[PDB]
PDB file of C-alpha atoms in Angstrom:
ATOM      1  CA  UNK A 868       0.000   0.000   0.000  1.00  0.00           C
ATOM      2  CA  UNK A 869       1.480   3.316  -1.106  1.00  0.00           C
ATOM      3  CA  UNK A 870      -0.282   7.167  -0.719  1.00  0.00           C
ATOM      4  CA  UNK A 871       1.157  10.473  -2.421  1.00  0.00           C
ATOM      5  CA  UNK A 872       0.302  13.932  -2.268  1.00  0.00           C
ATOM      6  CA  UNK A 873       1.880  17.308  -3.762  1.00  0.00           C
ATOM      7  CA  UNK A 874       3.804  14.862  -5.764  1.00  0.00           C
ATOM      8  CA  UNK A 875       5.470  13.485  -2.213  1.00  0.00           C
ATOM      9  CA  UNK A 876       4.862  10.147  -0.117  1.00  0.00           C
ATOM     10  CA  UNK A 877       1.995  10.302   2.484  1.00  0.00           C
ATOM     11  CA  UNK A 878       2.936   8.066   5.208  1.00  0.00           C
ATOM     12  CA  UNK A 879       0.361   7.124   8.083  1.00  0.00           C
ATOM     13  CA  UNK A 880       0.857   7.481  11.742  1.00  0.00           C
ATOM     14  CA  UNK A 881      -0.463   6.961  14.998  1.00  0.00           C
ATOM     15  CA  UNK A 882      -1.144   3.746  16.468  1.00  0.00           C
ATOM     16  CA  UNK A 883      -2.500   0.573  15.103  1.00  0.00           C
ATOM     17  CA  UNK A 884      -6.706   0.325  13.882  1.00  0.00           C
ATOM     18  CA  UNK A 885      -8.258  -2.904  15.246  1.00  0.00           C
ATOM     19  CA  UNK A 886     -11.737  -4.819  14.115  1.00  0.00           C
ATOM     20  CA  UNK A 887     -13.891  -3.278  16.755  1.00  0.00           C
ATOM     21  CA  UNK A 888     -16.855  -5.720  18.234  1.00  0.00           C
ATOM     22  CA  UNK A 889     -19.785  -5.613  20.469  1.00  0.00           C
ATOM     23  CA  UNK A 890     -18.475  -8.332  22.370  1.00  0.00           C
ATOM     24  CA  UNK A 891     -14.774  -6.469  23.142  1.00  0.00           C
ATOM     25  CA  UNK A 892     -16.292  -3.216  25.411  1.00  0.00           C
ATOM     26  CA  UNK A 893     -19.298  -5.864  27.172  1.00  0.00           C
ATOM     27  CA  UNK A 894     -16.576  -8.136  28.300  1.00  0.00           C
ATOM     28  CA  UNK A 895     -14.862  -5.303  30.277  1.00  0.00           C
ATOM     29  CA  UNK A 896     -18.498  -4.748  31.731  1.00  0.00           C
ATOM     30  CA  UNK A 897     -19.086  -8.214  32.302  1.00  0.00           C
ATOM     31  CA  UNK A 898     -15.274  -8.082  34.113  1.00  0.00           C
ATOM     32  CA  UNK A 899     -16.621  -4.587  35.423  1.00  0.00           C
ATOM     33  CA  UNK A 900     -13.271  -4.445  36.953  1.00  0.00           C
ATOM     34  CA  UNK A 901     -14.592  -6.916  40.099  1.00  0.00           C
ATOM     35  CA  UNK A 902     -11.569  -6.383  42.309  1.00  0.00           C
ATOM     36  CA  UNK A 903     -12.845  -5.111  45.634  1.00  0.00           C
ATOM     37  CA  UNK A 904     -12.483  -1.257  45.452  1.00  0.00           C
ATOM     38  CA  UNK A 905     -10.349  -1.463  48.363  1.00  0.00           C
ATOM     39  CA  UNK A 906      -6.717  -0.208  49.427  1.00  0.00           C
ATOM     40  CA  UNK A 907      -4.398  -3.184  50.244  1.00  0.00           C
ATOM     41  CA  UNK A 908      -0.929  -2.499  51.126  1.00  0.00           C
ATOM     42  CA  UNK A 909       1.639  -5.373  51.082  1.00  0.00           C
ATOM     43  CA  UNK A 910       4.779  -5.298  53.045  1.00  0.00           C
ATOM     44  CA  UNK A 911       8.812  -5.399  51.802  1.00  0.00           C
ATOM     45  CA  UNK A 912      11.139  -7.358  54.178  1.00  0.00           C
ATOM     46  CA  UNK A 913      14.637  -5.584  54.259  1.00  0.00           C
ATOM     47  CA  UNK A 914      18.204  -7.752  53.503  1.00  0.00           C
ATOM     48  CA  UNK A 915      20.985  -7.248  55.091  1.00  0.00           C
ATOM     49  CA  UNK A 916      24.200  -8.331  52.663  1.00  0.00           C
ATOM     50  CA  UNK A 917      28.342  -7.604  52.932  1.00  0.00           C
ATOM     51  CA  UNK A 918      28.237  -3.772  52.539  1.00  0.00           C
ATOM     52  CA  UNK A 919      25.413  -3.046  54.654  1.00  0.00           C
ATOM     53  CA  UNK A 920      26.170   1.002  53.963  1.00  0.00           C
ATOM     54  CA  UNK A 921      23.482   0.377  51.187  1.00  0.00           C
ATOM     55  CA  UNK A 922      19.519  -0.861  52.059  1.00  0.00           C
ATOM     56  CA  UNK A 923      18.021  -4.084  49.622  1.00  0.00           C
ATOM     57  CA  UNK A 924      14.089  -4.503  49.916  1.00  0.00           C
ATOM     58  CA  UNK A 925      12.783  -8.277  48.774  1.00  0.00           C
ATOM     59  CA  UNK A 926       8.955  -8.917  47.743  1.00  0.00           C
ATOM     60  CA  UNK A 927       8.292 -11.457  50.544  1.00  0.00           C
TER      61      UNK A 927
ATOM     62  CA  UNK B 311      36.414   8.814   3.646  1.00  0.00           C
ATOM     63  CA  UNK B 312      32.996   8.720   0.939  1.00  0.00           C
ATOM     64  CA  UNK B 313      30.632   7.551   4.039  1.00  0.00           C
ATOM     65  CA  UNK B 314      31.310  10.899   5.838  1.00  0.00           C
ATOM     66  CA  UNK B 315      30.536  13.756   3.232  1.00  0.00           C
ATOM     67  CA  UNK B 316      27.056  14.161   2.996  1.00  0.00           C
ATOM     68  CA  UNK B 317      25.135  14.921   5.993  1.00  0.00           C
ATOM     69  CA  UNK B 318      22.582  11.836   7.554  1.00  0.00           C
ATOM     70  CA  UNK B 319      19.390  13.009   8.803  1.00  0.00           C
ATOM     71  CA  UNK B 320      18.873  12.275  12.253  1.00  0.00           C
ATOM     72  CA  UNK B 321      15.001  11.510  12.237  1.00  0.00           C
ATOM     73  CA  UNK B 322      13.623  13.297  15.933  1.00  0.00           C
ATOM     74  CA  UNK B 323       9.922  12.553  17.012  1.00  0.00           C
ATOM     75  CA  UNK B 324       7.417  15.415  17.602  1.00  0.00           C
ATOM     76  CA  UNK B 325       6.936  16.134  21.337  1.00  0.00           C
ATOM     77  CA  UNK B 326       3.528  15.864  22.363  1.00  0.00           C
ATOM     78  CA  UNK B 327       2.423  14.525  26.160  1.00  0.00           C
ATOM     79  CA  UNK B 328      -0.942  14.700  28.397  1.00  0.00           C
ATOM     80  CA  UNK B 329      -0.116  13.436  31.719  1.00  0.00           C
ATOM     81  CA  UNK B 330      -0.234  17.086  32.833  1.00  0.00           C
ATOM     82  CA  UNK B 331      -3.606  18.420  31.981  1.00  0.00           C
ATOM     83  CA  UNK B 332      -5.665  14.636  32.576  1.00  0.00           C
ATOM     84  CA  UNK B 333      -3.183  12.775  35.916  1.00  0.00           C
ATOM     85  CA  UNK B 334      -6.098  10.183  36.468  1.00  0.00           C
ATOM     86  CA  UNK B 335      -4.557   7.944  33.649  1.00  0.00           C
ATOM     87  CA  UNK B 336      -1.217   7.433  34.831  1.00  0.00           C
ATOM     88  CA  UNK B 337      -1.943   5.601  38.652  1.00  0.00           C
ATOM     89  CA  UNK B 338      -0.326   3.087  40.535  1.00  0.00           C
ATOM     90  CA  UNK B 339      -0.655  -0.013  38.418  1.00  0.00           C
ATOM     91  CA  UNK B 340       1.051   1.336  35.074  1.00  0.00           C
ATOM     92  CA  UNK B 341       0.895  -1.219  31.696  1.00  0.00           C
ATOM     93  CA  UNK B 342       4.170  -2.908  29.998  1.00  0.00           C
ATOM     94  CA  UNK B 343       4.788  -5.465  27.422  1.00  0.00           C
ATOM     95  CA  UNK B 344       8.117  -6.442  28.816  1.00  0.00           C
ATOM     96  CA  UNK B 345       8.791  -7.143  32.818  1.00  0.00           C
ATOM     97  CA  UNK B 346      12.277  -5.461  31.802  1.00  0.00           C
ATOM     98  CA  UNK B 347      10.985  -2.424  30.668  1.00  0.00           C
ATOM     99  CA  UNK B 348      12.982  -0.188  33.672  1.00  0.00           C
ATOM    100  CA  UNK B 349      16.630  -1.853  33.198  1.00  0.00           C
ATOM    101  CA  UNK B 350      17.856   0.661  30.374  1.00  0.00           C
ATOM    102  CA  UNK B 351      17.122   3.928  32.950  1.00  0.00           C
ATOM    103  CA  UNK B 352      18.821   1.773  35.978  1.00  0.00           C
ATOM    104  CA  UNK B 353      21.798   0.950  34.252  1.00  0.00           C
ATOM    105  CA  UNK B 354      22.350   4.754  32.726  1.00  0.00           C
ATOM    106  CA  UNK B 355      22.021   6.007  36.203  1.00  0.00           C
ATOM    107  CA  UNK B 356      24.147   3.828  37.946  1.00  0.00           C
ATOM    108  CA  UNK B 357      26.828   3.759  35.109  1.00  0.00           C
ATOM    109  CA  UNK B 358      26.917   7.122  33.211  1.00  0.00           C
ATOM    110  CA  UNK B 359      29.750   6.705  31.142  1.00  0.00           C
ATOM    111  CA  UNK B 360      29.392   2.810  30.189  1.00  0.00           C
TER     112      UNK B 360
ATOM    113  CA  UNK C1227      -5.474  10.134  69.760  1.00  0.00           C
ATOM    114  CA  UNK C1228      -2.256  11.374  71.089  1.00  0.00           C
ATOM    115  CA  UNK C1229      -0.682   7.656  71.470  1.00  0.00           C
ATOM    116  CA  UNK C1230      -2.014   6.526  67.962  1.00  0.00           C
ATOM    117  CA  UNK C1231      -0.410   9.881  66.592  1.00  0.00           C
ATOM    118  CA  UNK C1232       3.109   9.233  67.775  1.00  0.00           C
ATOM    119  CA  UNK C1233       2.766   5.157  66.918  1.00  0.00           C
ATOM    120  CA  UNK C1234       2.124   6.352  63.459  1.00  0.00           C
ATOM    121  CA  UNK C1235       4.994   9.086  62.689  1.00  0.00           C
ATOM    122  CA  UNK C1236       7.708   6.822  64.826  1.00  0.00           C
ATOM    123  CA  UNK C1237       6.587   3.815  62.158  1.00  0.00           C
ATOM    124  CA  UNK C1238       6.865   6.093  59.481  1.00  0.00           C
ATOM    125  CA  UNK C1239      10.067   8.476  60.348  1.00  0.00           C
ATOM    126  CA  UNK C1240      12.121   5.168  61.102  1.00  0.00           C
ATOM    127  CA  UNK C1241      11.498   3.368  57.875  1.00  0.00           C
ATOM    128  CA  UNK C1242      12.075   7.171  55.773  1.00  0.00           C
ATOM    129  CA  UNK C1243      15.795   6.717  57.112  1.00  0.00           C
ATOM    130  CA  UNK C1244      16.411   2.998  55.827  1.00  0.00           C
ATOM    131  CA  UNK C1245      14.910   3.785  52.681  1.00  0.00           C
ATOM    132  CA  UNK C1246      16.977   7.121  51.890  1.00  0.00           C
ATOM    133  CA  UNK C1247      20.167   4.299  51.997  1.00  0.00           C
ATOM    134  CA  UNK C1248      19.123   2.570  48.777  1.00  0.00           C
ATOM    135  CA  UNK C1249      20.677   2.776  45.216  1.00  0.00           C
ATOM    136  CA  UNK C1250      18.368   4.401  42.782  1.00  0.00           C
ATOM    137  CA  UNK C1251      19.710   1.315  40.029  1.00  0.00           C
ATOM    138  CA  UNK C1252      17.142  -1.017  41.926  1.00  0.00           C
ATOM    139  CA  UNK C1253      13.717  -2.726  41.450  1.00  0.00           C
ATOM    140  CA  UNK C1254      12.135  -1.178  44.901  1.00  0.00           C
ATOM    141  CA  UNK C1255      14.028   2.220  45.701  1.00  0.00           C
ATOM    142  CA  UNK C1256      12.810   5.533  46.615  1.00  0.00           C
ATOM    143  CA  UNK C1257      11.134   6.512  43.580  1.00  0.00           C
ATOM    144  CA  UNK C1258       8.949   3.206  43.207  1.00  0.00           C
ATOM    145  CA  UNK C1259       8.364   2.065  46.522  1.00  0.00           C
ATOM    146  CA  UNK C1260       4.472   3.241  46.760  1.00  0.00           C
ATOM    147  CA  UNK C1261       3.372   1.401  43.242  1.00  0.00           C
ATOM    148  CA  UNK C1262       4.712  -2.420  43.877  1.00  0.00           C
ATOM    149  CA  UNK C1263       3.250  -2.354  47.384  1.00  0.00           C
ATOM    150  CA  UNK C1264      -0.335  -0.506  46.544  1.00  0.00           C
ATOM    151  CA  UNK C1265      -3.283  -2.990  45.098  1.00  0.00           C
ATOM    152  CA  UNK C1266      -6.229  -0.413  44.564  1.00  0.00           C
ATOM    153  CA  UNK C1267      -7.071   2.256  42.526  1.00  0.00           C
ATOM    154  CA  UNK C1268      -6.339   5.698  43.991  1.00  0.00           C
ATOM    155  CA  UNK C1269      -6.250   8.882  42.051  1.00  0.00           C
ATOM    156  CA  UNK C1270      -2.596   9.883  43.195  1.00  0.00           C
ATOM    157  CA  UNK C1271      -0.541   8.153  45.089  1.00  0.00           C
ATOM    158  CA  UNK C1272      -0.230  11.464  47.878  1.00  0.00           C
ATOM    159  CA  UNK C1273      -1.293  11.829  51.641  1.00  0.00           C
ATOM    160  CA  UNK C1274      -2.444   8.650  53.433  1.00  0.00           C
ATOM    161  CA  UNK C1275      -1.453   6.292  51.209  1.00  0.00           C
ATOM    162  CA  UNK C1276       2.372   6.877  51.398  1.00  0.00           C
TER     163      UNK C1276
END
């Protein structure tokens, strides 16, 4: 596929068109984003190593 | 000595940005393809000159 | 009030200094510390949430 204008190319941009459905918006309502509208915070463990001048958090 | 006598084009995007104007779409819980999508920044800032 | 007030700044105040001694090349440090932990929605992460 080629475009040209004022005897120059005209190349497209932006980001990429999709096949839009009924079924691809409803899912998101049937999902209706079910998590629990509600603020849990969960902890970092700090780990000590050789230097000890410098601070290491770990996900458990 | 022929590669270096006409001048490349160095091809810059435009800069555009909304995070300013509407904050309520950049949260907490941002979206990435890749899980190593933060090395590049973490790497220039720990070694500048590398 | 006054005993729930200074349980809440010494928690805070304490872990503020073991944080500041963190590398910024890191996955948790003290830029992204607030969005790992954090499993809502919130508007900004600001105030009580920090």
């Amino acid at each position: 596929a080629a475009m040209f204008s004022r005897n120059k190319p005209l190349y497209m941009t932006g980001g990429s068109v999709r096949t839009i459905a009924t079924g691809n918006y409803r899912d998101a309502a049937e999902r209706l984003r079910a998590m629990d509208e509600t603020l849990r915070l969960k902890p970092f463990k700090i780990t000590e190593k050789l230097d000890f001048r410098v601070a290491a958090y770990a996900i458990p | 000595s022929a590669w270096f006598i006409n001048a490349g084009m160095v091809n810059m995007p435009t800069l555009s940005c909304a995070n300013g104007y509407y904050p309520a779409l950049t949260n907490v819980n941002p979206y990435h393809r890749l899980d190593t999508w933060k090395d590049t920044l973490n790497h220039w800032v720990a070694y500048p000159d590398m | 009030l006054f005993y729930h007030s200074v349980a809440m700044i010494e928690s805070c105040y304490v872990e503020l200094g073991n944080v500041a001694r963190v590398s910024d090349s890191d996955a948790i440090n003290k830029y992204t510390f607030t969005e790992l932990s954090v499993q809502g929605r919130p508007v900004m992460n600001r105030g009580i949430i920090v």
